[PDB]
Amino acid sequence: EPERNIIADKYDEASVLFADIVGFTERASSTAPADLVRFLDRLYSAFDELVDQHGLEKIKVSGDSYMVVSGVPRPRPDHTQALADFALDMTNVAAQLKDPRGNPVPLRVGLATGPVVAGVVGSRRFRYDVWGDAVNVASRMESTDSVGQIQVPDEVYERLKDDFVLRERGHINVKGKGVMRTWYLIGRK
């Protein structure tokens, strides 16, 4: 049954992360849906542990993705930095796990900051959900990410540049809109 909206509110500013493990479908890998589910549950349980250790908020999403949010529902003035630190731990932890073949986990991570909408949605049962501008951006940062990096837009770079190390990935000129630039979040300063 499709979910429906119940209540929502706009938040001026929050930070949103998406992560996934790309190419772990039965189609792509031939691994049985049950073995996939077990290996993913391990990886996602590791991320669950990091979310709790960091005091952040996991948003139950449908689909392959893992979603984490900072400064929504409850604001914190370091929301971007806190999600960056969590993102770094998430990719550094995943880098110590391997698939069953002993190959690196093909993790993608995108991270964005900006307005969002949050509230309650549900079908039979309900859950807290977050969507809108920064979620859209985070989603695109994750789905065009190079595997093993953390991709972020300019807005995140402006907010983090003094305290983390970032390297520019590239830019594209879109006439007549403007320039689209993204960065890799590499580490802490």
XYZ file of C-alpha atoms in Angstrom:
189
model
C 0.000 0.000 0.000
C 1.430 3.428 -1.001
C 2.254 5.776 1.909
C 0.317 8.991 2.409
C 1.144 12.251 4.151
C -0.219 13.038 7.584
C 1.630 16.167 8.859
C 4.572 18.164 7.594
C 6.637 21.276 8.447
C 9.348 23.216 6.619
C 12.825 23.426 8.158
C 15.018 26.272 6.958
C 18.200 24.273 7.128
C 19.262 20.660 7.817
C 21.862 18.191 6.631
C 20.941 14.996 4.765
C 23.028 11.994 3.764
C 22.302 9.056 1.393
C 24.475 5.957 1.098
C 24.099 2.769 -0.873
C 26.001 -0.287 -1.987
C 25.900 -0.195 -5.732
C 25.499 -3.315 -7.932
C 24.404 -5.625 -5.100
C 21.221 -6.790 -6.870
C 20.695 -10.371 -7.962
C 20.608 -8.996 -11.534
C 24.064 -7.446 -11.239
C 25.913 -10.038 -9.069
C 23.869 -13.295 -9.246
C 24.012 -13.495 -5.403
C 20.667 -14.841 -3.993
C 18.313 -12.174 -2.614
C 18.692 -13.829 0.879
C 22.541 -13.609 0.875
C 22.316 -10.044 -0.322
C 19.931 -9.210 2.529
C 22.345 -10.766 5.072
C 25.464 -8.968 3.866
C 23.541 -5.653 3.684
C 22.085 -6.081 7.148
C 25.642 -6.391 8.469
C 26.730 -3.201 6.681
C 23.578 -1.319 7.661
C 23.854 -2.503 11.302
C 27.373 -1.019 11.341
C 25.928 2.277 10.071
C 23.073 1.994 12.667
C 25.731 1.743 15.351
C 27.497 4.872 13.948
C 24.182 6.806 13.814
C 23.616 6.044 17.544
C 27.242 6.730 18.524
C 26.989 10.087 16.651
C 23.521 10.932 18.074
C 22.038 11.419 14.633
C 18.738 10.395 13.032
C 18.166 7.471 10.643
C 15.167 7.880 8.319
C 13.547 4.624 7.272
C 13.399 4.732 3.531
C 12.130 2.159 1.048
C 14.588 0.936 -1.603
C 18.254 0.012 -1.390
C 19.400 3.312 0.232
C 20.385 4.243 3.786
C 19.371 7.755 4.936
C 20.626 9.877 7.802
C 19.647 13.376 8.760
C 21.173 15.971 11.185
C 19.492 19.075 12.645
C 15.971 17.775 11.908
C 13.565 17.344 13.830
C 15.818 18.873 16.511
C 18.255 21.663 15.453
C 21.902 21.655 16.397
C 24.238 24.415 15.355
C 26.989 21.967 14.143
C 24.521 19.924 11.923
C 26.705 19.914 8.816
C 29.971 19.140 10.610
C 28.284 16.371 12.601
C 26.968 14.678 9.475
C 30.412 15.065 7.779
C 32.134 13.371 10.715
C 29.528 10.618 10.604
C 30.008 10.300 6.788
C 33.784 9.917 7.221
C 33.333 7.247 9.873
C 30.767 5.466 7.695
C 33.133 5.230 4.671
C 36.236 4.470 6.805
C 34.312 1.599 8.578
C 32.991 0.218 5.279
C 36.555 0.268 3.886
C 37.506 -2.379 6.550
C 34.742 -4.752 5.426
C 34.979 -6.737 2.199
C 32.358 -8.602 0.173
C 32.386 -12.428 0.244
C 35.005 -12.414 -2.570
C 37.245 -10.196 -0.422
C 36.692 -7.164 -2.664
C 36.015 -3.651 -1.291
C 32.381 -2.780 -0.495
C 31.195 -0.522 -3.402
C 29.730 2.174 -1.124
C 28.419 5.479 -2.494
C 27.736 8.453 -0.170
C 26.221 11.804 -0.961
C 25.660 14.659 1.476
C 23.748 17.993 1.131
C 22.613 20.895 3.341
C 19.625 23.171 2.792
C 15.854 23.456 3.354
C 13.860 20.298 3.840
C 10.322 19.265 4.799
C 9.811 16.725 7.540
C 6.874 15.040 9.174
C 4.880 11.845 9.428
C 3.838 9.569 6.522
C 2.459 6.035 6.604
C 0.256 3.307 5.286
C -0.858 0.732 7.867
C 1.899 1.928 10.212
C 3.630 5.365 10.235
C 7.203 6.713 10.287
C 9.032 10.039 10.445
C 10.181 11.171 6.967
C 12.292 14.044 5.491
C 12.111 15.283 1.887
C 12.557 18.364 -0.304
C 15.454 20.511 -1.590
C 18.398 19.179 0.403
C 17.136 15.566 0.108
C 16.999 15.937 -3.684
C 20.492 17.338 -3.791
C 21.837 14.584 -1.402
C 20.196 11.968 -3.581
C 21.949 13.256 -6.697
C 25.263 13.518 -4.827
C 24.945 9.853 -3.934
C 23.733 8.543 -7.302
C 26.484 10.249 -9.291
C 29.157 9.581 -6.625
C 32.353 7.763 -7.491
C 32.431 4.561 -5.446
C 34.302 4.967 -2.136
C 34.121 8.785 -2.001
C 31.738 11.222 -0.310
C 30.324 13.653 -2.842
C 29.043 17.083 -1.673
C 27.838 20.259 -3.416
C 29.321 23.783 -3.163
C 27.031 24.802 -0.334
C 28.476 21.978 1.840
C 32.021 22.898 0.777
C 31.465 26.564 1.827
C 30.308 25.345 5.221
C 33.099 22.827 5.822
C 36.207 24.161 4.038
C 37.884 25.557 7.184
C 37.483 22.352 9.150
C 37.689 19.445 6.734
C 39.765 18.588 3.720
C 37.827 18.597 0.455
C 39.007 18.264 -3.140
C 37.028 19.567 -6.078
C 35.656 16.794 -8.246
C 34.668 18.856 -11.280
C 32.156 21.405 -12.494
C 29.724 21.586 -15.390
C 28.523 24.798 -17.045
C 24.771 24.675 -17.747
C 23.656 27.629 -19.909
C 21.770 29.585 -19.058
C 21.286 28.302 -15.491
C 24.896 28.432 -14.147
C 27.803 26.320 -12.934
C 27.398 23.017 -11.061
C 30.407 22.059 -8.973
C 30.925 19.152 -6.587
C 33.580 18.199 -4.092
C 34.944 15.081 -2.448
C 34.955 15.111 1.348
C 38.331 13.554 2.212
C 39.011 13.978 5.921
C 39.192 16.226 8.955
C 41.698 19.086 9.250
